[PDB]
Design a protein around this nucleic acid. Structure first.
Ligand code: MG
Ligand code: MG
Lengths: 708, 743, 249
RNA sequence: AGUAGUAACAAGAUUUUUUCCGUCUCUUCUGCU
RNA sequence: ACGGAAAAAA
């Protein structure tokens, strides 16, 4: 049973037997005679291994206690399985002995042999031949004991002494007499002879299981028997006959000559929301800048400001309607005064009241916990209103027309490559030189470098100068067609108090950008701006030298770490254009079976339609297409919003429907009105989304004229 | 001329310029504030597509539970969740019939894997709701807290190491009348800041232990915590994702393993394949389906999306699917696989972290939690939140909302793929015996359907048959986003098929740039990303060369490692200039050390230190690949001080780690991690393979280390490596450690 | 010799908390406590490396670097500083220290990079002695097939190779798993003869033998040969409309 | 004010599949020809 | 086997 093993054994033997029973997942309460057999095996291995010591010379001596000596045997049975296999692997990789296929019980260092000890209740020879049949192939010493007062080793040559084996036999005869006097011998003799897994439900989870069914069933076992005893009697057609006729996917045929254009929203005109002036930006340049401190942004800013000395007094020309404009004027005067007398590399501004207003210091309410906000009778929720709808204006089309144009400056300088060895590397170098000849002088490359410089310097000032009001000049560096360097300054950015911890935390800043565009011609573009008139410039055209007023667009803007991160990585826009363009160059190269790079670039034929005019559809060359796709990627990065993601994802389906129509693949829809409501939901107030919607309507009209 | 980039679609096909339709160069839309409103939107949309079902009060949690399955049939094209049980069982029966011996091998693989899986398979999820703390945690610390609270309450079956014994402890822990947990608290103290003279509150985090109730523990065990998905492309409005607790995380793995073994052997399932293997499998089944159309037959492909997937996937339907797939298996296996649909049919959703409230008079803002939105007068919310709270108030039980109908997002992907593949498997031309027939492809919810028929009337009949059979089981096809054309072009999981899967490089644009680990790792990442896009996503060779140039420019700026002959100046230009001037063979200097760019199209598969090795100076390659270099970690030589050499260069350094939060004292919660890392660091002194492979065993760490110490001392004594006094000292110290662990 | 780790274990078992942890946690549960963490895990490392190299001390090396490099450069650059802590084991390090070690540090005679990363040197020797032919331009019929990106050993599968690696590097922790094959023993004895008195880390030797012996397979669009020397130059030999005729060495 | 968009910042605390890479470890600086 | 990045689908 169980209490006999808890009485007539040492507690360490019971602990080893319990640890070896818990390794197999069997309690001694469910199997008591197996626990008794495991405890008897443990005790026989312990009596075999104990009191046998190897001295300094090597002869095995038997000692009564643990008087410096080492044990003769290493005990393997009784440990964990991985512990025992670690012991076996340490022994077998010290001698040249092959590994035993099964776990042995002891290891004699004196004869260097693993020892398997079985304690049986049948005759000793039967269990000996059973073990020799089970261990046929490996050289493991066997030593079987029984409760019959007899033993059998391998080849009848005992390696242990006679006294310890006599103690083993006497202890086993004592245990046999004790099992006889307890009425437990023949039960244990017939207790010999893998289990299964089980997973029962506790009553709480059974009551949860009863309430997780179809509503007809009340017991989990009833539903289980129903599912296990289910054959199909045509339930699908029986339920389809009972379903109403108004549940159907009626295919309406798709024809883009019959569908309507997108309905752009109606309201005020869309406002400029970029981080810098794109087409209206005027730069102050230095040609081959060799001043003392070239490279430092504020030194280059002062060296560019020294090229223009037409500084009159600044007057507010165009007011910001929602903001105090005298604060903006005092901000510009403080900025110019602090620039004109400063030392060091950086310019941190004094936190004055107008600059505190312009950078939004103190506008956040103080944050307290709700435990200290329990008797506040004015706690109202934040407003989660949707954006107001805006109408499309022509300035964003003007920006995209100006952003696809070539300039007289190499705006993006590519680093060196390796040596071209393969012929495809020379082919790719020629195509890359064509791409760089068409793409590096674009206005979109200037916008890429302007955004990279602004976002990099703004991130560095935000992460190193979290308290101070950093002046970050808008510096770019280019090379003209003469092969000489040039450093251009577009204005300044006064950084706020940027303690951003979240990803979407906004650092406010103030952008003061030089320009020559009058804000009274297109005033709806400049709602968020306060425009001063800070100077006069003798602009010398081919004919006249006129006095154009140099304006300064001042506005409060804001950004986050994610927007600055994606602004710093805008050069990958150069990939998204050119990988498209090269693929077209590759596509014809699969048809013409030659290298169609040089026929596309040199033989200017105006093959691809890229424009709409009052005359009609305009066609340009592959370099114009590469500049247009570059400006498209640039404006996707600058004017990125959730409206653009939704509009692109939803209008992709309508573009694919038009393409399926043009392939004569007979396209059909199931709810075209719902698709139009899904497209027109994302056209709210972003100028780039409104421009892409107008582009989609123009492409739809071009498709409709192409089928006539 | 007004410039229009869309007019390039007048010459180029749309699938051949589809990379222009992906604006993947700007920042993706992030979600501000709390995910409470999206969670209440999900609960209301779940209970409004299922409102004609049976309302019942749960006998264990007291929550209001909706039972919409086997309810009234849908009467419109709106999303409905009244799935019929017999139609689902007929579809699973036909799926077993058309694939003989499919459920048996999958159930047997799940039988073989259930016996072998251990508890640390649950340390694979990204984050996990910790019911001990009412907080999102990583999977390992949530599992550790669950195991400690279990075995400090007597549930010690998970000491055997198997996952199924931990699941037995999970199921048995629902019987405790008072579960005692280890929670956290804080101590606010107004201390002035020493750099702004402004009063802040130094909240100190500490450990608290309190008792739960039985109903409170059962609520916390069936709780799915919620948050908002960030940086998601293609959507105008955001949505909430959810994470389950450690009680539901265990059974979900076994159900997903069974349904994954089913989905691997189905020819119509797009899961769990991905990348080029998925494209090859998809193209092979397209080629097999287009060769079944006869010479006079019409074939039409639907590109189809499903509207409101998890709001209509009922867990009781998944219980029926689990009990039908596992027909013939032992009942313990059926119960173990059936626990997770029962736990998801009784789930509750935690409603986030409340809202933010602005007092305009006191100029205050305060975060009100989701448990405090029940005793607040409704005059303070805006109208959308007031409507949502009035529609959700009758489901609130203990600060969580009842969500018995429907699923949360991404819970059962493979089982839903099994259901969709069964619907696709219904329409064989031998099962239907009709004029129309179909096949197709099925993701978690995205699908592509190919209907063949003799006339377009038969195509419309087959479309209506597929639509109504999807409606029978709670699958609502989105009529706004699905469209049907002839076979040859479609879209499936943003893969565009136009007589073959076209490439899409714009989807792989955010993987470009400097990854930000160290110098050599970022160089390898950049060159391997350019090479991978050259192979897979059809990055052209000139654009690949320009990508190499842009990566080298961004990498030289990022680590301030411009060329040695530059005129630029940074914080490390003088040292790089000295190294440039003193080096004879300057073409062997790395880009991180101010050397030239060696990369072109031919050598993107070769690392930088290997490619420049023939051009390095002996002094430079001695200093760079020095085994005594201090920037990397050196391991001590074990019993089998003297440290091992280093193979990595000096550019494989470790950047600085910042973990401090604002005004937060976290020395109480990090000391457990420090003692755990001390124990795991001292464990590897005895077992050197515990970092290469995971060690197994049911013994304790101390017993394993003492046994390894004794056997290593005996091997070193008998082998002639140590002396007898060393062996006696090690064995007596092991005896002293045993005597310390006894008393 | 092993008295040091046994005294470390005795010192760690003298404390009651670490004794409780070492006596209650199993070897299986150690994986549940090795991955334990309670602080906020730092995410988005690319932006952090963008703004963190602007800082003067972005590298955290070990404390022993205080004895290996000077505190100042020749130009006065502060290479390392102490951390504001009442402890040890970590210091904040400038990248000028990395450039100083690469231009003025100790020159070693033994380097382990040609041996541990010998597969990439084999790929470089194949590319260097290659032979480029002309470029044909035609439509590539690419079929996504399973191909060997690592050839492995010809006499070993993946499981047999990992068993050989576990027997070579970590032989006393292999459990009750013996290699049945007969080439496994020959390659095991060859690697054990090659890797005796090895001065490098065991996991580095294991990863070297893993990139030598274990074959890896990927699904890639193959237009042409499927040998393991052609999958490594798949970006070079083919595109979408062109084919580079390449022959390795 | 501004960023921004169904809710926050305007200082005070990461649910499933696939591809690729890596391997043991807590101060005053912002310069892309 | 751990960790990180990108994408897809909900
Ligand atoms: Mg789809
Ligand atoms: Mg959907």
């Amino acid at each position: 049973m169980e209490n006999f093993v808890r009485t007539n054994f040492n507690p360490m033997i019971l602990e080893r037997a319990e640890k070896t029973m818990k390794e197999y997942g069997e309690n001694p309460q469910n199997e008591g005679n197996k626990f008794a057999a495991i405890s008897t095996h443990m005790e026989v291995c312990f009596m075999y291994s104990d009191f046998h010591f190897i001295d300094l010379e090597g002869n095995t001596i038997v000692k009564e206690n643990d008087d410096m000596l080492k044990h003769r045997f290493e005990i393997i049975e009784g440990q964990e399985r991985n512990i025992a296999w670690t012991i076996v692997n340490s022994i077998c990789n010290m001698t040249e002995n092959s590994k035993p296929r099964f776990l042995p019980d002891l290891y004699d260092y004196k004869t260097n042999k693993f020892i398997e000890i079985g304690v049986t209740r049948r005759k000793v020879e039967d269990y000996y031949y059973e073990a020799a049949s089970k261990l046929k192939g490996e050289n493991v010493y066997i030593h079987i004991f029984s409760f019959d007062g007899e033993e059998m080793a391998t080849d009848d040559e005992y390696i242990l002494d006679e006294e310890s084996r006599a103690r083993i036999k006497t202890r086993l005869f004592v245990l046999r007499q004790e099992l006889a006097t307890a009425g437990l011998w023949d039960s244990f003799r017939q207790s010999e002879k893998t289990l299964e897994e089980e997973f029962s439900y506790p009553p709480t989870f059974q009551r949860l299981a009863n309430q997780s069914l179809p509503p007809s069933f009340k017991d989990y076992h009833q539903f289980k028997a129903y599912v296990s005893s289910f054959k199909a009697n045509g339930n699908i057609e029986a339920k389809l006959g009972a379903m109403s006729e108004k549940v159907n996917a009626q295919i309406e045929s798709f024809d883009p000559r019959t569908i309507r254009e997108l309905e752009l929203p109606e309201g005020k005109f869309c406002t400029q929301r970029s981080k810098f002036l794109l087409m209206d930006a005027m730069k102050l340049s230095v040609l081959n800048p060799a001043h003392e401190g070239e490279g430092i942004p504020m030194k280059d800013a002062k060296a560019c400001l020294d090229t223009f000395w037409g500084w009159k007094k600044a007057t507010i020309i165009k007011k910001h309607e929602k903001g105090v404009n005298t604060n903006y004027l005092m901000i510009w005067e403080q900025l110019l005064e602090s620039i004109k007398e400063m030392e060091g590399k950086f310019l941190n501004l004094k936190k004055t009241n107008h600059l505190k207003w312009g950078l939004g210091e103190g506008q956040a309410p103080e944050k307290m916990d709700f435990e200290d906000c329990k008797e506040v009778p004015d706690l109202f929720q934040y407003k989660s209103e949707p954006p107001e709808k805006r109408k499309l204006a022509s300035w964003i089309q003007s920006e995209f027309n100006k952003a696809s144009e070539l300039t007289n400056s190499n705006w993006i300088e590519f680093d060196e490559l390796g040596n071209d060895v393969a012929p495809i590397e020379h082919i790719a170098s020629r195509r890359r030189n064509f791409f760089t000849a068409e793409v590096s002088q674009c206005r979109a490359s200037e916008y890429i470098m302007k955004a990279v410089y602004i976002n990099t310097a703004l991130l560095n000032s935000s992460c190193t100068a979290m308290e101070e009001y950093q002046v970050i000049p808008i510096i770019t560096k280019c090379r003209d067609t003469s092969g000489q360097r040039r450093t251009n300054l577009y204005g300044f950015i006064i950084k706020g108090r940027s303690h951003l911890r979240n990803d979407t935390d906004v650092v406010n800043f103030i952008s003061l950008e030089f320009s020559l565009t009058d804000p009274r011609n297109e005033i709806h573009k400049w709602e968020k701006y306060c425009v001063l008139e800070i100077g006069d410039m003798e602009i010398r055209t081919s004919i006249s030298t006129i006095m154009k007023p140099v304006y300064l667009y001042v506005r409060t803007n804001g950004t986050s770490k994610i927007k600055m991160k994606w602004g710093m990585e805008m050069r990958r826009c150069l990939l998204q254009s050119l990988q498209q363009v090269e693929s077209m160059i590759e596509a014809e190269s699969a048809v013409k079976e030659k290298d169609m790079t040089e026929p596309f670039f040199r033989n200017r034929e105006n093959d691809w339609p890229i424009g709409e005019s009052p005359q009609g559809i305009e066609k340009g060359t592959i370099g114009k297409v590469c500049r247009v796709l570059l400006a498209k990627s640039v404006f996707n990065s600058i004017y990125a919003s959730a409206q653009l993601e939704g509009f692109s994802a939803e209008s992709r389906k309508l573009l694919l429907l038009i393409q399926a129509f043009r392939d004569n693949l007979d396209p059909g829809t199931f709810d075209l009105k719902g698709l139009y409501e899904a497209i027109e939901e994302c056209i709210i107030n972003d100028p780039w989304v409104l421009l892409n919607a107008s582009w989609f309507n123009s492409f739809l009209k071009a498709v409709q004229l192409s089928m006539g | 001329m007004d410039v229009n980039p869309m007019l390039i679609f007048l010459k180029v096909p749309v699938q051949n310029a589809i990379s222009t339709t992906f604006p993947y160069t700007g920042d993706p839309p992030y979600s501000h504030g709390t995910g409470t409103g999206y969670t209440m939107d999900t609960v209301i949309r779940t209970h409004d597509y299922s409102s004609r079902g049976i309302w019942k009060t749960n006998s264990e949690t007291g929550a209001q539970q909706l039972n919409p399955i086997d309810g009234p049939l849908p009467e419109d094209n709106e999303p409905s969740g009244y799935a019929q049980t017999d139609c689902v069982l007929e579809l699973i029966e036909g799926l077993d019939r058309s694939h003989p011996g499919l459920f048996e091998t999958a159930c047997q693989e799940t039988i073989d894997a259930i016996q072998q899986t251990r508890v640390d398979k649950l340390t694979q999820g990204r984050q996990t709701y910790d019911w001990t703390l009412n907080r999102n945690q990583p999977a390992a610390t949530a599992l550790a807290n669950t195991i400690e609270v279990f075995r400090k309450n007597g549930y010690k079956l998970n000491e055997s190491g198997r996952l199924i014994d931990f699941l037995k402890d999970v199921l048995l822990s629902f019987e405790n009348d008072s579960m005692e947990v280890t929670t956290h608290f804080q101590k606010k103290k107004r201390i002035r800041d020493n750099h702004s003279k402004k009063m802040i509150t130094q909240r100190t985090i500490g450990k608290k232990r309190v008792k739960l109730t039985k109903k409170n523990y059962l609520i916390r065990a069936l709780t799915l915590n919620t948050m908002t998905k960030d940086a998601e492309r293609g959507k105008l409005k955001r949505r909430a994702i959810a994470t389950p607790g450690m009680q539901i995380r265990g059974f979900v793995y076994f159900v997903e393993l069974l349904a994954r073994n089913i989905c691997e052997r189905l020819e119509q399932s797009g899961l769990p394949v991905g990348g080029n293997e998925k494209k090859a499998k998809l193209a092979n089944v397209i080629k097999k389906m287009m060769a079944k159309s006869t010479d006079e037959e019409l074939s039409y492909t639907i590109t189809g999306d499903n509207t409101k997937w998890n709001e209509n996937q009922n867990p009781r339907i998944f219980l029926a699917m689990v009990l039908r797939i596992t027909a013939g298996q032992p009942e313990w296996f059926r119960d173990l696989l059936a626990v997770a649909p029962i736990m998801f049919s009784n789930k509750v959703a935690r409603l986030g972290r409340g809202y933010m409230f602005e007092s305009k008079s006191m100029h205050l803002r305060t975060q009100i939690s989701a448990e405090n939105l029940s005793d607040i007068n409704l005059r303070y919310f805006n109208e959308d939140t007031k409507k949502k709270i009035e529609k959700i108030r009758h489901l609130m039980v203990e600060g969580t909302a009842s969500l018995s109908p429907g699923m949360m997002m991404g819970m059962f992907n493979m089982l839903s793929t099994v259901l969709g593949v069964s619907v696709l498997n219904l329409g064989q031309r031998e099962i239907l015996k009709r004029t129309y027939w179909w096949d197709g492809l099925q993701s978690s919810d995205d699908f592509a359907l190919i209907i063949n028929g003799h006339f377009k009337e038969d195509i419309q009949q087959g479309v209506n048959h597929f639509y109504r059979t999807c409606k029978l089981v709670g699958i609502n096809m989105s009529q706004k986003k699905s469209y049907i054309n002839k076979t040859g072009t479609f879209e499936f999981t943003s893969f565009f098929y136009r007589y073959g899967f076209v490439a899409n490089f714009s989807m792989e644009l955010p993987s470009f740039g400097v990854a930000g680990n160290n110098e050599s790792a970022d160089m390898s990442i950049g060159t391997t990303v350019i090479k991978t896009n050259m192979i897979n996503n059809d990055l052209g060779p000139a654009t690949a060369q320009m990508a190499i140039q842009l990566f080298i420019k961004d990498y030289r700026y990022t680590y301030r490692c411009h060329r040695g002959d530059t005129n630029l100046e940074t914080r490390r230009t003088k040292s790089i200039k000295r190294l440039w001037t003193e080096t004879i063979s300057k073409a062997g200097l790395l880009v991180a050390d101010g050397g030239p760019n060696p990369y072109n199209l031919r050598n993107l598969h070769i690392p930088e230190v290997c490619l420049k090795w023939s051009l390095m100076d002996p002094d430079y390659r001695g200093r760079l690949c020095n085994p005594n270099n201090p920037f990397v970690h050196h391991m001590e030589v074990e019993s089998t001080s003297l440290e091992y050499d280093a193979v990595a260069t000096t550019h494989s350094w470790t950047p600085k780690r910042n973990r401090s939060i604002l005004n937060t004292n976290q020395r109480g919660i990090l000391e457990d991690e420090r003692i755990y890392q001390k124990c795991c660091q001292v464990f590897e002194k005895f077992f050197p393979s515990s970092t290469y492979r995971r060690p197994i065993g049911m013994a304790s760490m101390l017993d394993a280390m003492l046994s390894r110490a004794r056997i290593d001392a005996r091997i070193d004594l008998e082998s002639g490596r140590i002396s007898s006094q060393d062996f006696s000292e090690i064995t007596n110290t092991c005896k002293a450690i045993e005597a310390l662990k006894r008393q | 010799s092993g008295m040091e780790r046994i005294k470390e274990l005795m010192e760690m078992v003298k404390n009651s908390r670490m004794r409780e942890i070492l006596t209650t946690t199993s070897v299986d549960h150690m994986a549940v406590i090795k991955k334990y963490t309670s602080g906020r895990q730092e995410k988005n490392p690319a932006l952090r490396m963008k703004w963190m190299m602007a800082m003067k001390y972005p590298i955290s090396a070990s404390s022993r670097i205080r004895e290996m490099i000077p505190e100042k450069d020749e130009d006065g650059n502060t290479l390392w500083t102490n951390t504001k802590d009442a402890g040890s084991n970590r210091v904040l390090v400038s990248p000028n220290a990395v450039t100083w070690w690469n231009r003025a540090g100790p020159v070693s005679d033994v380097v382990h990079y040609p041996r541990v990363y010998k597969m990439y040197f084999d790929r470089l020797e194949r590319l260097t002695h290659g032979t480029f032919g002309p470029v044909k331009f035609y439509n590539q019929v690419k079929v996504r097939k399973r191909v060997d990106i690592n050839p492995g050993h010809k006499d070993l599968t993946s499981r047999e190779a990992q068993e050989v690696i576990m027997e070579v590097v970590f032989p006393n922790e292999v459990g009750a798993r013996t290699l049945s094959s007969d080439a496994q023993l020959t390659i095991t004895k060859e690697k054990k003869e090659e890797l005796k008195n090895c001065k490098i880390s065991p996991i580095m030797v294991a990863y070297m033998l893993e990139r030598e012996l274990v074959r890896r397979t990927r699904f890639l669009p193959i237009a042409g040969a499927t040998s393991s020397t052609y999958v490594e130059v798949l970006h070079l030999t083919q595109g979408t409309c062109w084919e580079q005729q390449y022959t390795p060495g």
